[PDB]
Design a protein around this ligand. Structure first.
Ligand SMILES: *[C@@H]1O[C@H](CO)[C@@H](O[C@@H]2O[C@H](CO)[C@@H](O[C@H]3O[C@H](CO)[C@@H](O)[C@H](O[C@H]4O[C@H](CO)[C@@H](O)[C@H](O)[C@@H]4O)[C@@H]3O)[C@H](O)[C@H]2NC(C)=O)[C@H](O)[C@H]1NC(C)=O
Ligand SMILES: *[C@@H]1O[C@H](CO)[C@@H](O[C@@H]2O[C@H](CO)[C@@H](O[C@H]3O[C@H](CO)[C@@H](O)[C@H](O[C@H]4O[C@H](CO)[C@@H](O)[C@H](O)[C@@H]4O)[C@@H]3O)[C@H](O)[C@H]2NC(C)=O)[C@H](O)[C@H]1NC(C)=O
Ligand SMILES: *[C@@H]1O[C@H](CO)[C@@H](O[C@@H]2O[C@H](CO)[C@@H](O[C@H]3O[C@H](CO)[C@@H](O)[C@H](O[C@H]4O[C@H](CO)[C@@H](O)[C@H](O)[C@@H]4O)[C@@H]3O)[C@H](O)[C@H]2NC(C)=O)[C@H](O)[C@H]1NC(C)=O
Ligand SMILES: *[C@@H]1O[C@H](CO)[C@@H](O[C@@H]2O[C@H](CO)[C@@H](O[C@H]3O[C@H](CO)[C@@H](O)[C@H](O[C@H]4O[C@H](CO)[C@@H](O)[C@H](O)[C@@H]4O)[C@@H]3O)[C@H](O)[C@H]2NC(C)=O)[C@H](O)[C@H]1NC(C)=O
Ligand SMILES: *[C@@H]1O[C@H](CO)[C@@H](O[C@@H]2O[C@H](CO)[C@@H](O[C@H]3O[C@H](CO)[C@@H](O)[C@H](O[C@H]4O[C@H](CO)[C@@H](O)[C@H](O)[C@@H]4O)[C@@H]3O)[C@H](O)[C@H]2NC(C)=O)[C@H](O)[C@H]1NC(C)=O
Ligand SMILES: *[C@@H]1O[C@H](CO)[C@@H](O[C@@H]2O[C@H](CO)[C@@H](O[C@H]3O[C@H](CO)[C@@H](O)[C@H](O[C@H]4O[C@H](CO)[C@@H](O)[C@H](O)[C@@H]4O)[C@@H]3O)[C@H](O)[C@H]2NC(C)=O)[C@H](O)[C@H]1NC(C)=O
Ligand SMILES: *[C@@H]1O[C@H](CO)[C@@H](O[C@@H]2O[C@H](CO)[C@@H](O[C@H]3O[C@H](CO)[C@@H](O)[C@H](O)[C@@H]3O)[C@H](O)[C@H]2NC(C)=O)[C@H](O)[C@H]1NC(C)=O
Ligand SMILES: *[C@@H]1O[C@H](CO)[C@@H](O[C@@H]2O[C@H](CO)[C@@H](O[C@H]3O[C@H](CO)[C@@H](O)[C@H](O)[C@@H]3O)[C@H](O)[C@H]2NC(C)=O)[C@H](O)[C@H]1NC(C)=O
Ligand SMILES: *[C@@H]1O[C@H](CO)[C@@H](O)[C@H](O)[C@H]1NC(C)=O
Ligand SMILES: *[C@@H]1O[C@H](CO)[C@@H](O)[C@H](O)[C@H]1NC(C)=O
Ligand SMILES: *[C@@H]1O[C@H](CO)[C@@H](O)[C@H](O)[C@H]1NC(C)=O
Ligand SMILES: *[C@@H]1O[C@H](CO)[C@@H](O)[C@H](O)[C@H]1NC(C)=O
Ligand SMILES: *[C@@H]1O[C@H](CO)[C@@H](O)[C@H](O)[C@H]1NC(C)=O
Ligand SMILES: *[C@@H]1O[C@H](CO)[C@@H](O)[C@H](O)[C@H]1NC(C)=O
Ligand SMILES: *[C@@H]1O[C@H](CO)[C@@H](O)[C@H](O)[C@H]1NC(C)=O
Ligand SMILES: *[C@@H]1O[C@H](CO)[C@@H](O)[C@H](O)[C@H]1NC(C)=O
Ligand SMILES: *[C@@H]1O[C@H](CO)[C@@H](O)[C@H](O)[C@H]1NC(C)=O
Lengths: 508, 508, 508
């Protein structure tokens, strides 16, 4: 801001050419200004979604922004209604053989001895019976002649009878003591097989109890477990089905947000145009009176050229002016000067310009070439040549534009990144559930149930007897009759001398 | 844009009535302009959420938009602080009977034969003993008289004794061979029952091994599986809970977004009003000087009325002017003309209007009725009658309004639809887990354990008896005394002639 | 709006000092106006996300909002291309003893009786054999002398033989009947043990079938269940993995939305500045002609000072005026009045101010001190003193500021709160899966498998022996030779008188 620049040199003494109107021609202008606008309501639902029903249902939850934006576009406080609705969701036998061999005679001399008794085997053969029965008879023959015991021959018969009865006795005694052994040991064995089958019955019973209980346990587990999976199934379905819903909504809400902005852009443009319409209405107030009620002394304002008269008329959202004016039909370039500094005495005009007919300056009217003479009534004089310099920099407003960081730097201010563990369950396939094989033992049991059959005793039929071999009381006197035959020969030997008469016949 | 319209006919030549001020009255106006604007700040959290704590937290994640919007409302780049905080999350017997029967004494003639020996049954009856013992005795009687073998009668006694001993021999031999058979077959049977019970023990043992191993396997599976169902129970619960968080947040963020816009509307309105306040401050600069430092030549500027003087008074956020003016006390309608075309020579005024006192035109001052005479110093003259036509259509800016498609057409540009399969698990209820039934066999086994009792052998007591039957050595000479009695009768028969004397008595 | 205020007292009259220019000085001003604004294209992706790739992808779904905002900033309907791309996702024995005691003599008199037969025990002792064999022999001695039955002595031998054979018969018969009993009861017992082992085999077979069937059932369940837990593992992994994704996106979209606004703020500021540039271009149209094509009669307009001439030049995005003017170098305070009411006749000036040299008023030019005399050609006169009052309150537009409720009250209009049940599965640990204990019975069965080993009968060896004691046919005549020895003594007793000669020797 200097009070001066140079000496006798400035734009203020530029002295250059400039067009001045010389002749004129009648003119008119039609000038149009808008003063009002068609503020119309906008349906956000029609603007953002249009006809996309999977959006129409969601945009509703965003709120009454639609009203806020319409309150802006249209200067009408919409008198909305009131609604109270809220959703709510709730033995000796061999030894006798070995010693006697095949000599039937050695029979009695081979008699063995068990304990305090003499024994023989119980079998007489045609050789032995010949020996003893002819010995018995010979002892009965000799005794009739011999003075004493011709019956010394009968000892072997009477003894071999006694010894054999003893042999039978010792052999029956053991047959019986064997019978007591086989009876006791079979009684003891069936006592132990009775225990065995009580124990097998108890073992089979216990197995049956558990195998059945555990079958029940598997059934119960299967009933519950197959229900549990049915429950897991239903629950995972609800989740997947809702996750899918969320994956539709979380996409659709992003496009809606973009359109919400795109709508806020349309709204902002309308307000910006509304401020220009209302500035054009403020301009129409000056423009209408400075010509209609008055006459403007300006240029190009309210009608191109120099304003004279005006006739206004209306339009649907505006005013139209049929202004009247005059314009240069003919105009000429003249060397002119804002000021002229004479010997340190700056000189300028009053209500006009300096213009130069070649020989000297005149003052003239800026907008009509009519030279006038220079005088104090027509000019100003200043004792200082120096030219004052001003500066006027019309800075239209510089907004404090937003100052966003990188997105990462704002994100990490509050964003919690996340990664849940890769969860897994415990493998049950380590369960072996071993099977059983007893088919060897079951086939073996069948084998012995078949083979026990062979052991079924099949003795050699002996026979009991003791049937009807009885004599009758009516005939029992049969032997008494024999005694009567002894009486009959008692007459024949009434004396023995008849035998002596037969011995006399043996002599003769 | 025509250089002409018609001949002697235009809005420029048509003369009509206009209101010219005739008398005046002193006036003032108070004119107010707001030059300043207290741009107050705004708390987004209070604006969007207010007091809804389930929202206050969400706004933090949105970012510092609140600052960006306040930098717009205000004009000072708020000097915010710096914070470095980041969350982080990590036998013969029958045949002897059949042939004998009960006839006399066929006993010996009925003797049978096994192998090379003759046999009889071992039973003598009072009938048979009478036959044989009286036969034996009769053979001892006859032999005393008969010259030879009267003992032919003794053959049947001596033979039947021998045959019976044989019968007893053949019947003992088999009684022994039956005894060996019974012993062997019982020894073989207990050999097979020993195998059977070794097998049964092996079968029961291995069954016990598996049933008990499989019980362990069920326990182990139940321990793991019941833990496993506990794990999914905990994991589903997280999924469910975290989704409750999502389904709340994904709803609440939609209403927040609507308010974010509703806030961007408030902010936009403020900037729009800020631009009008700053345009009103630009208008106050012209209005203040054109009337304070100077005097305006306009009719309605600085308040309706011809401005004369001004006195400004500062206001907190505006400026108040007490302007001084004059207004038409009396005004009159006059037929006036912008121009008048005389014989092809268009004619208009200088710094005024044409006005018509009935007989002829005058020039006058537009805003005061003072008629003046027409002259070149007071008017302009043209050569051409033709009227030039201009058009000035003040189009306030038409913005490039947004050009959104249907929502569907923008959605399908990037939207993915995702329907996951209706997942299901495999039904385990095809597991039958059969049960076991051994009752019949366990019952049968306890019934044979009861019934084996009947087989306990109960033999018929026989008796041994081989003890007190021993003669003493002190008395054994008892039979030697008998031999001494034989010596005593040896004197009585010292000769036999004493028996002859008794036979002589039998004669007499 | 009053037509009057007071009498002889108003701001229109109250006079006071004012600064009128007295001397002047040549001046210039440089005045700058912008008339154009660079409409640059802004990349939303660079503005919102910058370089954060986990955001760049999301902006795609946000749709063509970037174009809508650029259409606003840059008034150019960008001719975008067309793309058709859509993603798609598809016995008697004792009794004989008790009675006979120790008397070989009581032998026969102690014979017992079973049924219809007499019995003795089958054992002869050296005492009994002495009795009977010496009785037998004595009966053969006596019978040679006695007239009749000296053989009465032989009854006891012949009877005791018969009775003992019976004793042996009754004792063989019962031994045979014991043998049948044991055979039958062993045959019946092995018949019942055969049943038992058929039943044990059936029981073991049925326990093998099920235990092995249930092992298969456990295997099948384990195969399916371990697959089923694998399927769950995979499905819960999807849910979680995709939920994590949603928890990233639902956070990141909130910061994006905040920047979307922060961007809509930048865009709004640009439009606001664009409206001021275009208002500055509208101001440049008046400013350029009122000073270039003409000369303004206003104050401070076209730079400080009274405008005289102008020289315009271009600017980067505006216009620069080198205006020429004059300014007060020297100015003086003067007591001046807009109007002066003389005796009810209000009086004001024409095209100037009243100024007061001490003695009286003058009219003068507002912007130059040159006193002039008061006259009707230089002033206006009114009839009424009364001062008219106007008011002009320039209300810059008051917008319909948004009218948001509390957030809760808008939220509850459509927000559905949701709390799913705390789902749980049914506890399977109530499954007992009882084990089995059979050891006692298996050890008992192995102990009997060893116990019966003793019951193996070990009879007392008896012996058969029906071997070779046979006589040869070549020697059988041995006893016939005995008959020849009987013939040899038949000569010695050819008569008995030789025995009589020996009895005569017994006499002598
Ligand atoms: C710039 O404007 C100037 C103002 O008009 C012009 O200069 C003028 O020129 C005229 C022409 O002579 C002059 O007129 C008078 O000059 C003498 C008195 O000053 C006087 O002797 C003249 O009278 C005689 O001449 C005329 C014919 O010209 C005869 O009719 C008379 O009978 C007599 O013989 C006459 O009165 C002006 O004085 C003079 N003015 C000034 C101030 O200069 C310039 O011509 C013009 N520039 C250009 C380039 O044209
Ligand atoms: C009327 O007022 C206008 C409103 O302020 C002024 O506009 C300003 O003009 C200046 C200078 O041109 C400009 O400064 C920047 O210009 C470059 C583009 O923005 C930029 O590269 C510059 O940076 C360089 O220069 C500086 C200074 O030497 C260094 O510190 C830097 O390191 C770098 O080398 C510089 O920052 C303003 O941006 C601009 N403001 C606006 C809002 O337009 C007019 O200049 C003024 N006219 C006059 C003289 O009346
Ligand atoms: C539009 O304005 C016109 C301008 O004022 C008016 O016309 C004027 O009318 C007057 C009245 O006569 C006239 O005055 C003179 O007329 C004669 C010379 O032109 C002359 O003879 C007159 O003098 C005689 O008459 C007067 C009385 O009127 C006597 O006092 C004298 O002693 C003498 O006897 C007088 O000087 C104007 O000349 C005339 N002007 C013009 C240019 O027309 C119109 O009346 C007015 N329109 C309306 C509708 O009123
Ligand atoms: C001053 O400038 C204004 C700014 O441009 C002009 O406003 C324009 O005026 C025209 C005509 O009224 C208008 O055109 C449309 O008008 C109807 C409503 O928008 C619309 O239905 C029209 O469509 C019909 O007519 C055309 C042409 O025959 C056919 O092609 C169509 O098929 C259909 O039948 C037409 O598009 C502009 O919208 C409007 N623009 C703006 C931004 O206001 C003034 O007309 C102008 N005044 C003058 C003459 O100085
Ligand atoms: C406000 O402006 C007023 C206008 O200029 C000033 O008043 C003026 O004062 C002068 C000075 O006297 C006066 O001049 C004449 O006064 C008489 C006729 O009215 C006449 O007698 C005077 O002539 C005599 O005096 C002079 C010297 O002054 C001699 O040269 C003469 O030879 C003779 O002897 C003279 O013509 C004005 O009339 C008068 N005007 C009015 C309307 O008042 C004021 O002075 C000024 N205010 C201030 C504070 O200065
Ligand atoms: C030029 O037009 C301007 C635009 O309308 C007017 O501004 C208005 O001025 C009034 C009064 O100052 C103001 O009213 C409110 O002022 C307070 C702050 O907003 C507020 O507390 C007031 O409330 C109190 O007073 C009322 C009335 O007695 C009671 O009902 C209330 O209960 C309470 O006690 C009052 O509401 C407007 O807000 C304001 N409007 C705007 C948009 O600026 C200028 O007053 C006007 N100037 C003139 C006189 O030409
Ligand atoms: C994206 O997937 C959506 C399912 O998740 C699918 O919605 C389904 O659309 C079909 C076709 O419109 C509907 O089928 C029936 O819909 C109504 C029923 O009254 C009828 O008007 C139709 O004619 C048709 O019979 C399904 O009911 C519907 N499913 C659900 C759960 O809403 C969308 O269509 C898919 N979008 C695209 C672009 O493919
Ligand atoms: C929507 O459901 C929300 C649960 O999903 C529920 O939040 C719950 O609100 C109750 C009541 O405020 C809380 O109970 C306690 O909250 C604090 C605990 O310190 C106390 O101040 C309270 O007095 C009360 O004892 C629950 O803790 C809370 N649950 C959770 C998980 O945050 C909302 O209230 C529900 N909203 C509506 C409108 O019903
Ligand atoms: C005006 O221009 C003329 C040339 O046309 C020149 O001679 C004269 O000195 C200039 N005057 C001033 C004051 O610059
Ligand atoms: C201004 O000062 C100049 C130089 O002294 C002088 O010539 C001129 O007359 C003065 N103007 C006024 C109105 O006093
Ligand atoms: C499964 O069987 C293998 C061999 O077949 C054995 O090594 C392992 O110990 C068994 N595991 C279980 C739990 O039975
Ligand atoms: C002006 O109006 C009058 C009628 O009052 C008419 O006679 C005259 O011709 C008009 N003049 C023009 C130039 O239109
Ligand atoms: C303009 O032209 C007209 C018609 O020829 C003429 O009468 C008039 O004098 C001219 N005006 C000027 C200032 O040359
Ligand atoms: C289940 O039992 C039915 C008959 O009861 C049979 O047809 C089917 O094969 C069995 N399935 C299994 C796996 O045991
Ligand atoms: C002007 O001020 C003077 C005092 O300087 C006073 O005498 C006079 O009455 C005032 N005039 C008016 C109209 O107020
Ligand atoms: C206006 O009225 C006043 C007061 O009656 C009077 O003196 C004056 O001459 C009138 N002015 C006009 C132009 O008629
Ligand atoms: C589990 O065992 C307990 C005792 O050990 C018993 O009371 C209960 O009934 C059993 N439950 C099942 C299902 O076997």
């Amino acid at each position: 801001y200097t009070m001066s620049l140079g000496a006798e040199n400035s734009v203020a003494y530029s002295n250059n050419s400039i067009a001045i109107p010389t002749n004129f021609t009648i003119s008119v202008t039609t000038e149009i200004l808008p003063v009002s606008m068609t503020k119309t309501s906008v349906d956000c639902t029609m603007y953002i979604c249009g006809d996309s029903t999977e959006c129409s249902n969601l945009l509703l939850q965003y709120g009454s922004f639609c009203t806020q934006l319409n309150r802006a576009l249209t200067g009408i406080a919409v008198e909305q209604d009131k609604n109270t609705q809220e959703v709510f969701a709730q033995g000796f036998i061999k030894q006798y053989g070995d010693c006697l061999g095949d000599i039937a005679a050695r029979d009695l001399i081979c008699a063995q001895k068990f304990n305090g008794l003499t024994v023989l085997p119980p079998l007489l053969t045609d050789e032995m019976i010949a020996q003893y029965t002819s010995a018995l008879l010979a002892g009965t023959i000799t005794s009739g002649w011999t003075f004493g015991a011709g019956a010394a021959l009968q000892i072997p018969f009477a003894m071999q009878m006694a010894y054999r009865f003893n042999g039978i006795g010792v052999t029956q005694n053991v047959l019986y003591e064997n019978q007591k052994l086989i009876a006791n040991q079979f009684n003891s064995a069936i006592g132990k097989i009775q225990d065995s089958l009580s124990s097998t019955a108890s073992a089979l019973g216990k197995l049956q109890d558990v195998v059945n209980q555990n079958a029940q346990a598997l059934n119960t587990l299967v009933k519950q477990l197959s229900s549990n999976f049915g429950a897991i199934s239903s629950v995972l379905n609800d989740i997947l089905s809702r996750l899918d819903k969320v994956e539709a909504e979380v996409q659709i809400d992003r496009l809606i947000t973009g359109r919400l902005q795109s709508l806020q852009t349309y709204v902002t443009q309308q307000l910006i145009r509304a401020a220009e319409i209302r500035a054009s209405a403020n301009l129409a107030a000056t423009k209408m009176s400075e010509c209609v009620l008055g006459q403007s002394k300006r240029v190009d304002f309210c009608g191109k050229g120099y304003h004279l008269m005006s006739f206004p008329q209306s339009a649907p959202h505006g005013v139209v002016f049929l202004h009247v004016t005059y314009v240069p039909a003919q105009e000429k370039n003249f060397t002119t000067a804002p000021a002229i500094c004479h010997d340190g005495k700056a000189h300028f005009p009053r209500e006009g310009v300096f213009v130069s007919n070649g020989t000297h300056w005149f003052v003239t009217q800026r907008n009509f070439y009519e030279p006038q003479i220079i005088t104090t009534d027509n000019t100003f004089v200043s004792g200082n040549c120096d030219v004052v310099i001003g500066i006027v920099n019309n800075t239209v407003y510089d907004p404090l534009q937003p100052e966003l960081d990188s997105f990462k730097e704002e994100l990490d201010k509050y964003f919690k990144n996340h990664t849940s563990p890769d969860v897994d369950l415990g493998d049950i396939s380590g369960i072996n559930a071993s099977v059983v094989n007893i088919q060897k033992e079951i086939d073996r049991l069948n084998e012995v149930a078949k083979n026990l059959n062979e052991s079924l005793i099949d003795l050699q039929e002996l026979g009991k007897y003791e049937q009807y071999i009885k004599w009758p009381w009516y005939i029992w006197l049969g032997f008494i009759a024999g005694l009567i035959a002894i009486v009959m020969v008692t007459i024949m030997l009434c004396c023995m001398t008849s035998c002596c008469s037969c011995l006399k016949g043996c002599c003769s």
